[PDB]
Ligand binder design. Structure first.
Ligand code: HEM
Ligand SMILES: [Cl-]
Length: 367
C-alpha cells in the first residue's frame, strides 16, 4: 500500500478513482480535515434528521448512523462536549490501566499471542471501566469486530444481523439503567441528555467500540515495529512517549478517513464539485517526504512527529489522550517485564481501513 502512496504522492496527489476522490499529501490532507466548513462529516443524514429525531419521532435504523463521528457543527460541539472532558488526561483512570495491564502480564508464558492475550483485553477492560459497565470481554470484542470489520465495505456497514441486535439491545438495556441519574458512568451522562432515543444508542456504541479495536491495533503494531527495528531498549530507559508516537505514524490503526463536500472546492489543479466523497489517507500523509525526514524509516525518538494518525481538527480522536496513555503503559510494562526473542507468526486484520493484527505470536523470556 505504501509504494502506491509514494507513487501517488508524486504522480497524482488529488486522484479520482471510480467515484471517490483521494488525497495522499499531508498538506492537502491536514487542510481538508480542518476544513469542516466545506469538507463535511455529515455522511449519515445525522444532521438532516436532527429535527425529526429530536421531535420524538422514532424509526428503525442502525444506531451507528448517529454518532458525533458523522456529525457537523454545531451538533458536533453538542455531542462531543457532553463527554469530552472525561477523556482529558486529568480524568483518565491511569491507575486502573496500570493495574489491569500489569495483571494482564502477570503470568505470560514463553510463547503467547500478544493480541488475544493482552492487546484485546486492556482496551475493552478500560473503556468499559470509564463506560461504567463490565460485560464479557469476548462479547464486547465480538461486537467490535462486527462493527469494525465491516468498515470501508460500501453497505455492509449499515446492515443489521442477529448478533448486531444483541449489540443494540445491550446498549438500550445499559442506557435505561443510568437514567434515574447520579451519573458516574460515561454511559450515565448519555442516557440523561436531550439526545433522541437512537442518538443515545449511537453515542453508546461509538465509545465502547471506537475505543478498543483501533487501540488494540496500535499496541500490536507497536510491539512488532519495536521488535523489527529494535526499539525495546530505548523504551526501557527513555520511556514510550515518542516511540508510541512513531508507531502511530509508521503503522497507523486507521489507514484513512472520508468526508463530503458542501461546495465546489479546488485542491491543487483538481476541482471537486459539491456532494463528493474525499478519502483522506492518513497513512500516506504520515509518510509524506515533504514533512517527515527519512519518512520510511522507523525512529522511536522521531520528533517532531505531527502525524495524522488520530486525525486533526475538531474531530481529532476524542480518545486520543486515553489511547496514548494505554499505549504507553502497556509497552513500558511489557518492555520492562519481557525481552522479545522473535516474531514467530502473524495474521492481519482482514480490513482495508483498519491496519492491525488479529493474531501476533512472539517468543519471549522474562527479564
Ligand atoms: C488507539 C488508536 C486510535 C486511533 C488511531 C484513532 C484514530 C482516530 C481517528 C483517525 C479519527 C478520525 C475521525 C475523523 O476525523 O474522521 C478518530 C475519531 C474518533 N476516535 Fe479514535 N482513535 C484511537 C483510539 C480511540 C479511542 C480509544 C477512543 C475512545 C476510547 C476513541 C474515540 C474516538 C471518537 C469519539 C472519535 C470521533 C471524534 C469526533 O468526531 O469528535 N479513539 N479516531
Ligand atoms: Cl446474521
Amino acid at each position: 500500500m505504501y509504494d502506491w502512496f509514494k507513487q501517488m504522492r508524486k504522480e497524482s496527489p488529488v486522484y479520482y478513482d471510480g467515484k471517490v476522490w483521494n488525497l495522499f499529501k499531508y498538506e492537502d490532507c491536514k487542510m481538508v480535515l480542518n476544513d469542516h466548513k466545506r469538507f463535511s462529516s455529515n455522511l449519515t443524514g445525522y444532521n438532516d434528521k436532527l429535527e425529526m429525531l429530536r421531535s420524538g419521532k422514532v424509526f428503525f435504523d442502525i444506531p451507528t448512523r448517529y454518532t458525533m463521528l458523522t456529525s457537523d457543527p454545531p451538533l458536533h460541539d453538542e455531542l462531543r462536549n457532553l463527554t469530552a472532558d472525561a477523556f482529558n488526561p486529568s480524568n483518565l483512570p491511569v491507575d486502573f490501566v496500570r493495574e489491569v495491564t500489569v495483571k494482564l502480564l502477570s503470568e505470560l508464558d514463553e510463547e503467547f499471542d500478544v493480541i488475544e492475550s493482552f492487546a484485546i483485553p486492556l482496551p475493552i477492560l478500560v473503556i468499559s471501566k470509564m463506560l461504567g459497565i463490565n460485560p464479557d470481554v469476548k462479547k464486547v470484542k465480538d461486537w467490535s469486530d462486527l462493527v469494525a470489520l465491516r468498515l470501508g465495505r460500501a453497505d455492509e456497514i449499515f446492515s443489521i444481523g442477529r448478533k448486531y441486535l444483541e449489540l443494540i439491545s445491550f446498549s438500550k438495556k445499559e442506557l435505561d439503567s443510568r437514567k434515574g441519574k447520579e451519573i458516574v458512568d460515561l454511559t450515565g451522562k448519555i442516557a440523561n441528555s436531550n439526545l433522541s432515543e437512537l442518538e443515545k444508542e449511537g453515542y453508546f456504541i461509538l465509545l465502547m467500540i471506537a475505543g478498543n479495536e483501533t487501540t488494540t491495533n496500535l499496541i500490536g503494531n507497536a510491539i512488532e515495529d519495536f521488535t523489527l527495528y529494535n526499539s525495546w531498549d530505548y523504551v526501557r530507559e527513555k520511556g514510550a512517549l515518542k516511540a508510541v508516537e512513531e508507531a502511530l505514524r509508521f503503522s497507523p490503526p486507521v489507514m484513512r478517513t472520508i468526508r463530503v463536500t458542501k461546495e465546489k472546492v479546488k485542491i491543487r489543479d483538481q476541482v471537486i464539485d459539491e456532494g463528493e466523497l474525499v478519502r483522506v489517507w492518513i497513512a500516506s500523509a504520515n509518510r509524506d517526504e515533504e514533512v517527515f525526514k527519512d519518512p520510511d524509516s522507523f525512529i522511536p525518538d522521531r520528533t517532531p512527529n505531527p502525524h495524522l494518525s488520530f486525525g486533526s481538527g475538531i474531530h481529532l480522536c476524542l480518545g486520543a489522550p486515553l489511547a496514548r496513555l494505554e499505549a504507553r503503559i502497556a509497552l513500558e510494562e511489557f518492555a520492562k517485564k519481557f525481552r522479545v526473542k522473535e516474531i514467530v507468526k502473524k495474521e492481519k486484520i482482514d480490513n482495508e481501513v483498519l491496519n492491525g493484527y488479529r493474531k501476533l505470536v512472539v517468543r519471549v523470556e522474562r527479564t
